[PDB]
């Protein structure tokens, strides 16, 4: 495979001095274009992306309104955080006051923040709501239904 590439490279005509410099400039322009391309998270309508990074520390200042906001590769990892709502529902079998097994459902509408995207995105994970809601709902229902009769 490498032999074919070498032969093709050699077969390129040895044009005047200007053509090589033009090719070098074109390659540089393409690289710069790719670098600039990555550099703004096109977070979908009604979404956000705080910066995602690793930076020997992490500064929670540059928090970033809809769409157009300023990333870089491995400097700003984005992930398109949906500040638009995402709902939830959780149930609970409680030993009620009469010790009757009370199965109560509970639809929790927890949404993600924009200028405090951090705690969400990384350590709560992209799956923040899943990590958060289930057993808090369970505690709620069991505590309050052990407090309430049928």
């Amino acid at each position: 495979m490498a032999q074919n590439l070498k032969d093709l490279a050699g077969r390129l005509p040895a044009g005047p001095r200007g053509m090589g410099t033009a090719l070098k400039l074109l390659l540089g322009a393409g690289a710069v274009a790719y670098g600039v391309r990555e550099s703004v998270f096109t977070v979908e309508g009604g979404h956000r992306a705080i910066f995602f990074n690793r930076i020997g520390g992490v500064q929670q200042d540059t928090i970033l309104a809809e769409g157009l906001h300023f990333r870089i590769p491995w400097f700003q990892y984005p992930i398109i955080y949906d500040i638009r709502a995402r709902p939830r529902k959780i149930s609970s079998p409680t030993g009620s006051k009469d010790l009757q097994m009370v199965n109560i459902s509970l639809r929790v509408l927890s949404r993600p923040n924009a200028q405090e995207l951090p705690s969400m995105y990384q350590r709560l994970g992209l799956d923040y709501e899943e990590r958060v809601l289930p057993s808090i709902v369970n505690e709620v229902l069991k505590s309050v239904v052990a407090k309430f009769n049928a």
Binding site: R17, G20, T21, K24, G28, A31, I50, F51, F52, N53, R54, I55, G56, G57, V58, Q59, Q60, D61, T62, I63, R71, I72, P73, W74, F75, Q76, Y77, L117, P118, S119, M120, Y121, Q122, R123, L124, G125, R131, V132, P134, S135, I136, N138, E139
Partner: protein
């Protein structure tokens, strides 16, 4: 004269590209809520937490230790024997997070995955301590 100028331009462009590559490899922005730390052998991960600004790494020492210093909830179930000795299943949610400053030490001893080594042990031993003293 033109050939020398073109050669110098190409050499300067190559040098600029190399310098930019090095700078980018050492650099990475301000997210919120990690605090990575210089991962150095001579001292062990540098005793200093590397600050929350866009605070860098020098090459190859700080394998980005993604000290995700934000908060995570962790659910530990315990099948605890009550006073009447009824096997009661109790699931405890512990919200938790690491400490900013001592992320260096945390990696020298444990590593990136500090959290999972701890929460289950304390939580199980302690829910047992508690609900053992308590009835069904």
């Amino acid at each position: 004269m033109a050939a020398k100028v073109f050669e110098s331009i190409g050499k300067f462009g190559l040098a600029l590209a190399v310098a930019g590559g090095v700078v980018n490899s050492a650099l990475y922005n301000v997210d919120a809520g990690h605090r990575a730390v210089i991962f150095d052998r001579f001292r062990g991960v540098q005793d200093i937490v590397v600050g929350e600004g866009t605070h860098f790494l020098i090459p190859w020492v700080q394998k980005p230790i993604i000290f995700d210093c934000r908060s995570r909830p962790r659910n530990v179930p315990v099948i605890t024997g009550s006073k009447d000795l009824q096997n009661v299943n109790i699931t405890l949610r512990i919200l938790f997070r690491p400490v900013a400053s001592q992320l260096p030490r945390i990696f020298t001893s444990i590593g990136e995955d500090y959290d999972e080594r701890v929460l289950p042990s304390i939580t199980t031993e302690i829910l047992k301590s508690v609900v053992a003293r308590f009835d069904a």
